[PDB]
């Protein structure tokens, strides 16, 4: 109850103590992060970023196909040179198919979403390899791509070896 | 100049102090936030969120059209009931046309991107109004939508009144 009132109250405390007003547009680490919208992940705390360090791109499952527009802008307009892709344990995108979510939209809203692809995946590590390989194969992405699993159970980032 | 070594070292410190392993999938505030990938914005600090409070969806310019997949999953599978859309001052998406970025891709990569739409906007407040009205008009989004501008120069969230 009162989300808008609470975030505006918290913001007033943040703004009172804020001195980071001079930070420039290009990220200092020339880095873009692609990860899940998952509420339990604070990317800045997990990776030790401060304001101005890295682009942080977030979507349901941290899918690289959807991140690509954001990555091209990140690199071509704002100078980033590197991408990290982070999926996580206990991701919602493991727990349904396109058919299951289309059914839930019909059941709850009475709407047809048969032509929208929701990009769920069947295996966590396979999803990271598919995404990293996708970005390595793109002619529109420059630089090294690294894949990780974040363990929501212990706060650990686990780097994955992705062959090819 | 060793991004992967730096974030792995910082993560090892974060994991040593980590207590939050029992948090569940559904966000506690039943809230999804849509904002820019901009490096200077730590959404958790700006809004006073803790791990497990709100979904955080981020893309170049915080465009609601691209967030829609993520919002539908957030609401239908993970129980969120409300959306906040935050654009920001000094956003890169104000500073180019699709034809300007297509030129940079030709100059730097020697690639043609004439079939990709990058979704820049011409006016910051109009961009927030368009994105809020887009989500309010969608038959696949339930609940209240609020628009904000985040002022990168002063750390201030400014709520916009958006009609019809
Ligand atoms: Zn997830
Ligand atoms: Zn921006």
């Amino acid at each position: 109850m009162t989300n808008v009132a609470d975030i505006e109250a918290a913001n007033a405390q943040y703004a009172a103590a804020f001195t980071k007003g001079h930070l420039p547009l290009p990220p200092k680490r020339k880095l873009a992060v692609v990860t899940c919208m998952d509420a339990r992940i604070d990317v800045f705390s997990v990776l030790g970023l401060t304001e101005g360090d890295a682009h942080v791109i977030r979507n349901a499952g941290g899918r690289a196909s959807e991140a690509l527009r954001s990555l091209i802008i990140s690199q071509r307009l704002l100078g980033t040179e590197e991408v990290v892709v982070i999926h996580h344990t206990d991701c919602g995108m493991l727990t349904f198919s396109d058919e299951d979510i289309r059914a839930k939209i019909r059941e709850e809203l009475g709407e047809d979403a048969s032509d929208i692809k929701f990009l769920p995946f069947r295996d966590l590590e396979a999803s990271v390899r598919e995404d990293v390989r996708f970005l390595r194969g793109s002619r529109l992405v420059q630089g090294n791509v690294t894949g990780y699993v974040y363990e929501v159970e212990r706060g650990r980032l686990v780097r994955l070896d992705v062959s090819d």
Side-chain angles (χ1 to χ4, degrees), chain A residues 24-158:
Chain A
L25 232 53
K28 186 162 157 190
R29 290 202 205 175
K30 295 172 204 185
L31 179 70
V33 177
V34 183
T35 197
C36 193
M37 76 187 176
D38 195 284
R40 301 169 290 182
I41 300 181
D42 174 7
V43 180
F44 281 69
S45 302
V46 174
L47 308 189
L49 309 170
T50 89
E51 290 91 340
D53 279 343
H55 282 137
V56 179
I57 304 165
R58 300 185 72 167
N59 66 49
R63 300 324 306 271
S65 64
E66 194 167 83
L68 184 62
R69 179 187 63 89
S70 296
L71 292 175
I72 295 168
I73 294 163
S74 177
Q75 297 197 331
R76 300 278 58 89
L77 298 198
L78 308 172
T80 69
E81 293 171 13
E82 185 177 6
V83 187
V84 162
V85 176
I86 307 168
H87 294 188
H88 70 100
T89 56
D90 194 19
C91 186
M93 302 304 288
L94 274 170
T95 70
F96 72 95
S97 70
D98 276 342
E99 278 296 83
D100 296 331
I101 185 155
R102 287 167 184 155
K104 186 100 172 261
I105 294 159
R106 193 71 203 159
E107 289 154 18
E108 294 190 323
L109 310 180
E111 288 297 327
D112 171 276
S114 49
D115 300 352
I116 174 157
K117 320 172 65 187
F118 289 91
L119 316 182
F121 48 83
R122 289 188 185 166
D123 184 79
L124 180 58
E125 285 189 37
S127 214
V128 172
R129 288 198 249 257
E130 183 194 328
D131 281 5
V132 162
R133 283 166 179 162
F134 175 84
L135 294 180
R136 292 186 178 158
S138 173
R139 287 177 187 171
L140 292 167
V141 180
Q142 271 188 331
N144 287 342
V145 186
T146 309
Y148 292 90
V149 169
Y150 174 71
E151 299 175 340
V152 301
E153 301 93 348
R154 55 205 304 185
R156 279 209 313 167
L157 254 187
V158 183

